[PDB]
Amino acid sequence: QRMFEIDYSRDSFLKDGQPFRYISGSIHYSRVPRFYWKDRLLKMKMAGLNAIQTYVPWNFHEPWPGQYQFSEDHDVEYFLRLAHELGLLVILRPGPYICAEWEMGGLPAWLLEKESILLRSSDPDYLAAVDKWLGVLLPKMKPLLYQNGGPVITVQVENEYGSYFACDFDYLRFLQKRFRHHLGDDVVLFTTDGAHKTFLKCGALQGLYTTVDFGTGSNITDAFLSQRKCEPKGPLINSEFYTGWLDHWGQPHSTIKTEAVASSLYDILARGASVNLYMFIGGTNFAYWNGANSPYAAQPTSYDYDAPLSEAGDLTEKYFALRNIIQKFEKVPEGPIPPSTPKFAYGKVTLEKLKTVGAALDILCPSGPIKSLYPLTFIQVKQHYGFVLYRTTLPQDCSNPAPLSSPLNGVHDRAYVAVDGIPQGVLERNNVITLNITGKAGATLDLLVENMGRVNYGAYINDFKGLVSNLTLSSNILTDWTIFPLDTEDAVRSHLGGWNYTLPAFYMGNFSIPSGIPDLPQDTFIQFPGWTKGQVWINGFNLGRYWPARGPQLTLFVPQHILMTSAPNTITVLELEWAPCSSDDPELCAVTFVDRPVIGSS
Amino acid sequence: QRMFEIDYSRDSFLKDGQPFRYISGSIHYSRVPRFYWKDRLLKMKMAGLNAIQTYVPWNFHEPWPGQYQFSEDHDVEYFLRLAHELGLLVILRPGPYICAEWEMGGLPAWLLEKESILLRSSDPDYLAAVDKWLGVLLPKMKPLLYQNGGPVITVQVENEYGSYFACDFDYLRFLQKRFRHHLGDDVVLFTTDGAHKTFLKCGALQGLYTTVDFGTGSNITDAFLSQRKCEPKGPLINSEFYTGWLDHWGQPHSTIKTEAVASSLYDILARGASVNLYMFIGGTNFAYWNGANSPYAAQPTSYDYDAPLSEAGDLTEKYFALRNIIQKFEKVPEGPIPPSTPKFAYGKVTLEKLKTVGAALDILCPSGPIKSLYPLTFIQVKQHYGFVLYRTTLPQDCSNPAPLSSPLNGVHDRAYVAVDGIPQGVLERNNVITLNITGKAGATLDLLVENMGRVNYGAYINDFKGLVSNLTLSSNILTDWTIFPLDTEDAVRSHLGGWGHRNYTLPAFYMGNFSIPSGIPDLPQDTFIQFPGWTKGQVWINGFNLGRYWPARGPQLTLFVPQHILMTSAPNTITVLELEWAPCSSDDPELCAVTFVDRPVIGSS
């Protein structure tokens, strides 16, 4: 009964034998609480989109081999059925690598247990893992295919493989074969690459429909000409038409002008091309889900993207402008659009020190440390995200400053250094590979190492994290390590079992919200004036990383559904560098909730 | 164990042996949906108020003798417990007459079944009915008294009795006896009157503590001197310090400057006086609950009052200004204040005519009409609120226009007139007592008569409603009437029977539906409904009577729609009963419509 195909005669899609063109927007279900899925999708539908496009992050669903997460916020099948309910078609991008400014481009860190693994290639062990994953994911997606009564109209294989150095065509052919095994012979499979022959060379494959991506800076004729070299016939497709851009900590917030996005969108649509707006809503990298680029620069917690729907789902002037463009081509749904959420400034909330990381090792590492002659990586100690403590003893007297160094630039990505509980400062990947330290002979040398996000693009996606090479003190290699993987998420859930720099430490405070008020709790934004760099949880939910010292993001988005009115709300901060809490003024040791985000600070 | 008393020695109250003075604000639970009680009460607490003051409208709780309403939106006991739970004290004002720009000052219309009754007096039938009511209400209030562990610290007896002509001191003593009987000998009982000896003369009583009321235009020293003449010792008290004022249809919206309320408040508090701010939130006269003044002028649906909290509960500049003054005397609660609710513009919703009133008679009057030689009042036909259809036959040919008159000005308060389904215009209390009509001999003459609100103040609170005197056609008395009391609320809730029972246009019901999506955390939201092109009538959403609209007069153009009556997925049904002229005749279906907006317009030109 139901069919979706490429017709090579009208340079078109045919949906149930009818000319069809898609106008789609990207929304990542892993970047929006499920509480808000229907809000965002309905806002997208009201804009005149007839489809949405989404990535399936493998590492979001398979945190350990054979251990799966498909419930609640991880319920991709529900997310797709919801889109379908709303009258939206779906362009599925299941990877296995997705890029996406996301931790290791969606690839599970446990792949790195084979240290020599060649990711995104025909490496047999990489293929065997991919095959197992596809064996779990694709039979789920099969009933959601259009032909079987679901919303999924096309499926991307890999993601910009043409940008990767490997150029392993047998890898692409394997994915093609495995996608066909699980999904059948009708589903439209495609690939996406930059709009240039240099990208298309290694990214395009026979039997996979070749599509391009490009933003407002690209000559649209030339871009589609490049697609046409690969596909003389069939629909013109821009799979990621950029509505904005990504950010890095320390760099100015990226924006793209509404007039530019509207102008290019109209041009693309007028050509009869199918198009997807990347991103339509960007949302948030909660917890440790952000990625990074090479040379090492991490993307922030916010994935606002300057998208037409803001981080918290707000209707922007860009939203209305693009809706007006769509309305020139298609009738858009009638009625009022769901509103931007109300925001509430809960105001100042004082915190008090709970414990330093150093004093909390029983709770953070209840299994005990691992001893090693030389340092081990995050992967080797079986921890993928967050923080690992490296401990040794000083082999000599350091009454005069002595150089602590990582000659091979092997602090991945940042270390907070202490000696006998006295903070010495910070080592940084690519920036600070030496720090002068002092302490007595036999003093305890501690390095709290942060994985700031695995690189998600380029050759260096095999990003282990930790002390990945030796440390030297006064030119001598430091040996005899006591390494504590840190169970930060459990420890914060239990209030740490108690159910110029400062030592890394947890600070906690409470605030109440009245019950029986129809419009509370509301969404809010948490700000950290006087703090420096760390992690924040509210009611045990890890909202991400703050870094007001570096910017551009100052505030973090707090969705209302994690806030309660039946018992006090808890806020826990792990501050890594300097806390405003040693002063005699307790009101300084405090966070503030405001009703407007600040993501573009100078 | 717990104690609350007047300390006469030290011109003070004592709460548990400790000096105390109250800073209170009026909230009428009968004018706020219960869905929002905690919201309003918490904002009031956050303003620095340590008590609230409220009226108990008798008619709101006893629609017929022996039939009582104390549940859901009528749950006074719950409201008072909620206030207590928030740490607020309560000054209770149970009447039995409350004035309050409320229908008949709170008195039940069925009191008028005795035509010659003298309300607010020792009239035995009035007292008998008052006694029965107090014996139901006051035992419910007893456990909520401060000394029994509840919030209620003082209780008003009557309401500005000194403004009433009767000056019946037996009546005041009778109330005092009965309040003491039910509530006990410790409760502080007090009266409130205008701050002048001419008012205090008939309002004050030995044994009831005399308080005064006054707003920003009064000299504070003089006002409190007038109290002190009556109460040389004890706390100074302003029981109604006006934050704004009431409206009438056709008059500009009343406002009082923030700076004036703020300055007077500072001066009252600086004297050590206890004070209640009337109103703190005004809210809404939903359904037919509004009052009227004499000479006949009805107050509108909105009771915004220009209060510090707006009709929809919004934090205004006035709110923050008054909080700032209170902060100069007391510590005000810490923490952020619950916000103004979000408002949402659902937009235009088309309606279409369902049925005229004349066509819906079977559903509106399922028990059939009452026949009478001369017209009967609302009270006589056992209808208190809303609309009654009076029908007769023309005794003469009126091919040439013939004058239909109420010679004694007895259309109370408005009549929409039709002859054989042709609208003839409007008869109006005071303003138009004659209307020329045409029709053949034997043609059906209909007058749909609306009760626009029983006068709530003055001598003329015995306001019967309907045709209260004869009609004349060409000077001859019209006889042989068929009178249909109309169950509009029942009929609207059954979609004029469609859902079963589990220049002028004819008065008619117009209906339309709109949907709100489900699964959206922030929908439904509060809204405001506007009626462009409409004239005068009544409005319901999902069977809830939102009140009266009259964009033809103003100043209120929009009506407040609380979000809890709106539903998701299932269509919301809007019913408009238009009385005079609907924008629905033309080939433009788009004109027959209402519009939901996100800002109130209650102060338009």
Ligand SMILES: *[C@@H]1O[C@H](CO)[C@@H](O)[C@H](O)[C@H]1NC(C)=O
């Ligand atoms: C894009 O390139 C084509 C040639 O391929 C040229 O004709 C055109 O001027 C360019 N368009 C724009 C907007 O620069």
Ligand SMILES: *[C@@H]1O[C@H](CO)[C@@H](O)[C@H](O)[C@H]1NC(C)=O
């Ligand atoms: C550390 O101290 C030594 C000797 O004072 C000095 O030469 C060097 O520049 C310092 N190095 C760093 C990395 O601060």
Ligand SMILES: *[C@@H]1O[C@H](CO)[C@@H](O)[C@H](O)[C@H]1NC(C)=O
């Ligand atoms: C550290 O140094 C030792 C001795 O040179 C060497 O065996 C080892 O490869 C190094 N380990 C790391 C993790 O760099």
Ligand SMILES: *[C@@H]1O[C@H](CO)[C@@H](O)[C@H](O)[C@H]1NC(C)=O
């Ligand atoms: C905060 O609340 C938690 C649980 O929500 C409670 O156990 C604790 O006693 C409170 N602590 C403080 C410092 O307010």
Ligand SMILES: *[C@@H]1O[C@H](CO)[C@@H](O)[C@H](O)[C@H]1NC(C)=O
């Ligand atoms: C109010 O009246 C008193 C005398 O009773 C007088 O002293 C004062 O001037 C008056 N106040 C104002 C503001 O006129």
Ligand SMILES: *[C@@H]1O[C@H](CO)[C@@H](O)[C@H](O)[C@H]1NC(C)=O
């Ligand atoms: C009624 O009609 C008469 C003509 O017979 C005219 O004198 C009079 O003004 C009209 N009355 C009204 C109320 O319009």
Ligand SMILES: *[C@@H]1O[C@H](CO)[C@@H](O)[C@H](O)[C@H]1NC(C)=O
């Ligand atoms: C109407 O007129 C008759 C005859 O004069 C009179 O007896 C009766 O009381 C009047 N009724 C009303 C309701 O005015």
Ligand SMILES: *[C@@H]1O[C@H](CO)[C@@H](O)[C@H](O)[C@H]1NC(C)=O
């Ligand atoms: C409005 O909705 C109700 C319930 O679905 C239905 O009975 C009524 O017929 C509806 N009217 C229209 C015009 O849809």
Ligand SMILES: OC[C@H]1NC[C@H](O)[C@@H](O)[C@H]1O
């Ligand atoms: O936002 C930039 C963008 N580049 C192209 C990739 O395919 C996307 O996942 C992404 O990382």
Ligand SMILES: OC[C@H]1NC[C@H](O)[C@@H](O)[C@H]1O
């Ligand atoms: O709003 C005016 C105010 N007047 C005095 C009365 O006591 C109140 O009920 C009231 O009507």
Ligand SMILES: [Cl-]
């Ligand atoms: Cl996507």
Ligand SMILES: [Cl-]
């Ligand atoms: Cl009151």
